[PDB]
Amino acid sequence: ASMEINVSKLRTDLPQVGVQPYRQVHAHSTGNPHSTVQNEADYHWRKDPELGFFSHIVGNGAIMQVGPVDNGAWDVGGGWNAETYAAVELIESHSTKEEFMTDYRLYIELLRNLADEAGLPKTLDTGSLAGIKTHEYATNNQPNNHSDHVDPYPYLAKWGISREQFKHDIENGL
Ligand SMILES: [Zn+2]
Numbered sequence: 001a002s003m004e005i006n007v008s009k010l011r012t013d014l015p016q017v018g019v020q021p022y023r024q025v026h027a028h029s030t031g032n033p034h035s036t037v038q039n040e041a042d043y044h045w046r047k048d049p050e051l052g053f054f055s056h057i058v059g060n061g062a063i064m065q066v067g068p069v070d071n072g073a074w075d076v077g078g079g080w081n082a083e084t085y086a087a088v089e090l091i092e093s094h095s096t097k098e099e100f101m102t103d104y105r106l107y108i109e110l111l112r113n114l115a116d117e118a119g120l121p122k123t124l125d126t127g128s129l130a131g132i133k134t135h136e137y138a139t140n141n142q143p144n145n146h147s148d149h150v151d152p153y154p155y156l157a158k159w160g161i162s163r164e165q166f167k168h169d170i171e172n173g174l
Contacts (some may be wrong), residue, residue, distance in 0.1 A: 002004040002113050004055075005063045005105070009041040014049055017072025018082025021109050023130040025114045026075055026087040026138065027170075028054060036075075041066050049074060050138035055084075056114075057105045059091030070118070076138040077147030083129070085118040092155050108169045124170040132170055 029036065037059030044053065044066040054075045055067040066143055067087075075087035090107045092099040111132050115122045123131040136150040154168055 003063060003110060005065050007065045009043055009045050010065050011053070011067050014053055014067050014071070014073075017074060019072075020070065022070055022072060022083055022085035022118065024080060024083040024138075025085050025111055025118060025120060025132045026054075026073075026080075027062055027132060027134045027152055028087060028089040028094050029076065029155040032091050032092055032151065035091060036060050036093060037062050037064055037091055040064075040091060046125040047120060052077075054087035054089055056086060056088040056093065056105050056110060058088060059093070061102050061106070062158070063106055063110055066099055069114070069136075076142060077149065078142040078145035079136065080133070080138045080142035081140065085120065088114065089153055090155065094159065095144065097159055104156075104159070104161065105174055108174055111170060122171060122173075124167045125154060139153055 020086045037057050040057045041064040052066050052074050055069050057066055067097050069086045072082050073084040073087045075084055088111055090110055092118060099106055115132055121131040125134055125137040136153050139147040139149055
């Protein structure tokens with residue numbers, strides 16, 4: 001396998017959203033300034049799924065698979081919930097640029113790997129249905145939208161990753 005992924009807190013009780021095929025991988029960040037990857041995985045395990053759910057969390061040098069892939073998700077707050085092959089959240093609790101970069105590198109590699117696994121383009125926020133899409137892009141473009149979320153762009157910017165850099169990294173790898 002390409003990457004070490006901890007599946008110990010993979011929920012087995014989440015609903016399917018839509019039907020196959022799922023044409024998108026979604027890039028998110030948690031919005032939580034303090035939670036670790038384990039805090040997030042623990043909360044995700046116990047939370048009411050109606051409050052939203054996802055497939056992977058990246059943080060503290062680890063990747064935890066917390067929900068199923070290839071099954072849809074309640075991750076983007078609109079019609080593209082039914083296109084979610086995977087939904088990857090980056091933690092927001094980094095104290096240093098070094099900590100951020102350790103996780104950012106895992107995030108890029110994972111997003112690209114999931115797109116490959118799904119047979120989807122390694123492109124970011126394009127006008128095609130298929131590919132990797134940010135929550136911001138889904139908010140701005142999905143049908144039946146009920147979201148205002150713009151992750152992961154504000155958090156990436158906090159630690160010096162621009163819109164253009166994120167696109168370059170997704171499309172080329174690191
Ligand atoms: Zn999000």
